[PDB]
C-alpha cells in the first residue's frame, strides 16, 4: 500500500494558548493572541494547529479541568473569538485540532455538582462513588497528581475517583448515558468545522471491574494498570462508529500509560479507532517509572532503538505522531540537545532535522522553532504546575527525598519548562504581554526571540522553514521506510528514508567534536539536500562525511 492523507503529510504546530500571546495585558495568552499571529505560523510553513484546552475551567490543571465543555475559557476570550480563529485559519488554509478531555471533568462541572448532591441524584453514576474500606479509601489507588486517587465526600460518606487532581473527578464511561452526552458534546465542536481532535489520556476511560487493590509491584508502575480497562477498545470504537467516522477529521490518541506492544490497537486503521499515535516511549526514555519526576542518564543508542521500535510498531496499518517536547515535557534543545550558547542553535537545527524526517506526522511545539530552552527554576515556589506540587507533597514533605535533590531533578523534568511565555521579541517581557506574565519569562529572551530570527536566513526559525519546505517536496521524507544504519552507535545518528528507488540519508553528529563517518555497503551521495554546520564540501559519489560537532544534514543517495 502507502495510503496518503492530509494528516499524514501535515506539519502540525502546537499552541499552548496560556503562554502564546497576551493581547489584553492580564499576563495570560488568549485567542486573539493566536489570531494575531497566524501569519507568523503561515510564514513558518505550518499546515495545522493543535490548541491545548480552550474551555471554561477553574484552571487547577490549566484547562484540563473543564467546568463547561460548551463555553470558552474566560481568560482566552469569547465564543466569537473562537469562531473567528476557525475562520481566519480557514482563510489561510490551516486546519484546527482541539483537545478533547473526557476522562474527567472539573469538580465544578454541573454534572459533578449534581452527582455529589446525593446518592439518589440522576447524575450520581456519571462518576465513580465507592464506600471506604476499614475507615480508609476504597483501595490503595494513587493519584498522578499527589496522594490517593480517592477523595472522601462528607455529605454522602462515599469516596469519588480521581486519577488526576482532586478537582478532576473521573467520568463513568461504563454508563451509556455519559458516553452519549460526551458524543453530543463532540458534535457541537465538530459542527463548527474543527478538523482534528486530540484525545487526552485516551487510554484510561475504562475502569477496572470491582476496583481491586494494586500489588506492591503495581504501585510503582500504576499508570499501566489504569490502561488495562477491559472495555477501552469497545468505547473508543463505539465513539468512532457513532461520532468520529461521521466527520472528516484527524484524531490523535494520547496513550499515556500504554506499553508500546499495546498501542497498535488504538491506531490500526482496520480497527476504526483513532488515526495518530502520541506515545511516551521516546520523550520520557530517561524518566523513572516509579518516581516519575526523576530523570536518569540516557545514550544515543538507547534513543535510536526507541525511534526504531516506535516506527516498527506503527508498521503498515498504524501511524505515529513524532515530537521531542510539548507542554508536558522539558524543551527539546535542553533535554535532547545541548543548550549552551556555543551549541544551542546547531543542536536545535539538528533536532529539527531529525523531527522533520520521520515516518510520522511531526508536531512542532511553540517556541521550539526558535530554539527556546528550559527555564532556570530555583526554588519550589518558582513552579506553578499542580503536578510538581503533588510530587513535592508525596516525596519531599514526607521526608522521602531531600528538597534539593528533588529540585535538581524537577528543574530538568518539570512541565513548566515548556510553559514559560513564547519569546516574540527583545522588548520588555519578550513582547508577550503589556502587563505581568502569569509565569516568568526566560531572561534568555534577549538572545532567543522570533524578531531576531524571522528575517535572518541563518536562524533556527528559517532552518525549520527550509526543512518543512523540503519535507513537502520529497515524498520519501514522509512515507518512505526507515532503516537505522547502526542502532548501537552512540555518536553519529544515521538513517535512511526510502520509497522505491528514491533513497535519502539523514546524518546527525551528537558529539561536540569532529566525527568522521564512512557510509556502509555501497551507499554514496548523489546530492546534498541541506546541512547545518558543515565545513567540508560534499561531492558526487562521496562515501564519507567529516561531521563538524552538532552537524546535521539530509542527502540523496545514488540508486
Ligand atoms: O488532565 C490530565 C493531563 O492530561 C492531558 O492529556 C495533558 O496533556 C496534561 O497536560 C494534563 O495534565
Ligand atoms: Ca490575555
Author numbering: 42 to 600
Q: Can you provide the manuscript's text about this entry?
A:
Inspired by the work from Ravaud et al., we obtained the crystals of the D241A/glucose complex by co-crystallizing the D241A mutant with sucrose. Asp241 is the key nucleophile residue involved in the catalysis of the glycosidic bond cleavage. In the 2.00 Å structure, clear electron density of D-glucose rather than sucrose was identified in the active site. This demonstrated that replacement of Asp241 with an alanine residue did not totally disrupt the hydrolytic activity of NX-5, as observed in the complex structure of MutB D200A-glucose. Moreover, the D241A/glucose complex structure may represent NX-5 in an intermediate state of the sucrose isomerization process and could be used for molecular dynamics (MD) calculations. The structures of the D241A/glucose and E295Q/sucrose complexes are highly similar with a RMSD value of 0.14 Å, indicating that little conformational change happens after sucrose hydrolysis. After sucrose hydrolysis and the exiting of fructose, their side chains bounced back to the original position in the active site pocket. To elucidate the mechanism of the product specificity of NX-5, we used the GOLD program (version 5.1, released by the Cambridge Crystallographic Data Centre) to dock fructofuranose or fructopyranose, a transition state analogue of isomaltulose or trehalulose into the active site of the D241A/glucose complex structure.
